[PDB]
Design a protein around this ligand. Structure first.
Ligand code: CRS
Ligand code: CL
Ligand code: ZN
Lengths: 21, 30
């Protein structure tokens, strides 16, 4: 999920937009 | 569990910023 994707290596705001509703 | 805890604090801030009016869910069992 998001912790394994983004706490192990940096997620940009473009990558994080994937998680918006 | 503190590294993950601190990371999450920042993930929610960034999700807040990019998602805007869309909002977002932050949850899960694992
Ligand atoms: C903005 C942000 C916070 C925490 C982890 C990340 O990969 C990205
Ligand atoms: Cl921190
Ligand atoms: Zn911090």
């Amino acid at each position: 999920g998001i912790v394994e994707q983004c706490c192990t290596s940096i997620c940009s705001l473009y990558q994080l937009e994937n998680y918006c509703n | 569990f503190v590294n993950q805890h601190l990371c999450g604090s920042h993930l929610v801030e960034a999700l807040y910023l990019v998602c805007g009016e869309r909002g977002f869910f932050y949850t899960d069992k694992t």
